[PDB]
Amino acid sequence: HMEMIRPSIQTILQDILSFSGLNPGRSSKRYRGFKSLLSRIIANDKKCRYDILYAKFIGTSKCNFANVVSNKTEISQVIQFVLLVLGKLLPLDAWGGVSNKKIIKDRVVDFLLLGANEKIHMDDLFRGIRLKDFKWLGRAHQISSKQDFELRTAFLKGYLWWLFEHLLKNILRSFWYITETSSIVSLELNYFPQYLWKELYESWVSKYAKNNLVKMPSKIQREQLPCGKIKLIPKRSSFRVICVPIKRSLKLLNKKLELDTLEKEKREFERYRKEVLSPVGQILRLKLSKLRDTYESYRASVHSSSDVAEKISDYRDSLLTRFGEIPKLFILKFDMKECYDRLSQPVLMKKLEELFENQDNKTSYYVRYYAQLDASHHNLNILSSSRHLSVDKTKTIALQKGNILEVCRSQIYDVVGSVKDARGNLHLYKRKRGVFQGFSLSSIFCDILYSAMVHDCFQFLWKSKQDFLFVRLVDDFLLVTPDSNIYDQVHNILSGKILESYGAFVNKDKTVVVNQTTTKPSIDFVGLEVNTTDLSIKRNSGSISLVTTNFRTFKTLVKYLKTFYQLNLEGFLLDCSFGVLENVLENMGSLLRLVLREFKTKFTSIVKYDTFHCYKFIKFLYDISNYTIVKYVETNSDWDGAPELLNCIKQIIVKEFSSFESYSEIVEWVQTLNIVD
């Protein structure tokens, strides 16, 4: 009853022996001391009454249903509670003495703060720990030979791995349901108390199932259909419902499979995704590409936040060249509520069939995936030979129209999600509305449907009928035009139900309006702060540095930072408008200062074991500073301020790097940088 260490001593020991690559003999006596330590820890485990320990330390509260995300317990308090659990579980011997106990406790806080697929290399996490203080690593307390030292070194690393990978993780799951937030700017995790989560889950899913789901009988499990697992993701104040496809079939689920059937089901899972599902996604993405090339109405739909900024920058330059100045623009920002949930399944089906109505019933499309071209709408090496490309090979897949349409409707209708109740009995639900979020084809389905919707419902726009800007990223819409007659027509059909034929319901409350009367200083459409009456954009504070994950060397750090700076310094940020450098130099300064000090922060941690090469870093500074100037002159096509922009770069570099003895070389070099002669 509520015990952290479920596995037995033998199973635990075999888990670390396999990890460390150790294969002891049947007569080995080295691990006698460890078997004793485990028994003491398990004795402390059973003696602990964690239920009252949680109430004492954390405290029990009533389930909040108004703000469903308030139930989460702060990570700071979570870290302290597990540190209390570890102190009762692990004797001093398990910590490796006083000095190691301080280091190990410090590393636990580091591990718990990572979140969202962040990892710390075990060479970093387990560094500075005195191996000598771990007496139980061998039957003798003293190290005598090198074979003994190597063997104890492997065992200690395996033991430390079990503490963090098995023990620490199983403590978190016992008390908290750990899940990722729906946000993309912040990759922090939410720790909802386990008893509170079951109340939130049962409440939300039961209400959701009333409008979106249809309960299935137990004998639906015997059918082979797409099967996922219903989970909840809190965005900031409510829950998003997604479905994660399970790596097995409906019949074999819940749960028994152990005798290598779990692996062959997983080999069939990855096969179905790579042989039919992903090939279908390519074809469906390709069919939408042709409609983008053909119709200007399909070209209004973009597939990235970067395209939105460029579309606005193109419209700004259109008014600029045509009129010399930006007139009073009528802006219309609206979005669709529950876009994926409300989708009209039958209308989606017919729009997918219209992609193949031009061709015959058996067209036999050929697909052969290569990461160099999946979504485009540098040295690829194919033609294997006896000199250049010398069981899971790359092969061309042939899918006919009939099969493509059959698997499409299967991913729309036949998908079934499972819900395990309190007792354990699973409840299988089919969907009464649009596709489940989390399935590979659900994204492209909404793209084709909504891009078809904008085509025919807004056909008045594409009749010339010119001088307007309509853009739909995924579900948020934006319209900018000086024509008032265009403003009224789009607003008129938003007050109607013409869009309700599709799974599109306008979010009436979140519709932002800027017109001749309602004059607002600026509008945030998607992660961008578009300034009204000049169409100058500046990115909202919605992007953080990934650096922590997997980067532990100067080479890999500057490699990402270089590719990160050049990827975030896109065209729409360098626009000058012939008078304004401030909107550029301090827009660039934000990205520049944040990437430079991010390098300084990781510097002190990784310089302890790595070797810093100043000349290589100066080349990195030169590459990004050159890229900034060439991209500034490219976008504006004229440079009234290019020397001023470089002067800003140098001042930033000379400021951030005037503290350390090794940064001195940077300061002297950067001041010599200049474009003009």
Place this chain on the structure above:
RNA sequence: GGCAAGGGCUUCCCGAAUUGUGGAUAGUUCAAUACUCGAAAAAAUUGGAAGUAGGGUAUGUUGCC
């Protein structure tokens, strides 16, 4: 590198019953393991399409002439 210890691995047995400071026999080898930088010819540009010599870092490296 010589001498003196002691040890690791491998094998057998005695205890325990998810609670080992127990005994014995032969073989083997006892200072490095991991990580990160990284040269020198005829010049670059580059290190994952996975790098020597030689460095740095963490954990370590018996007493005695």
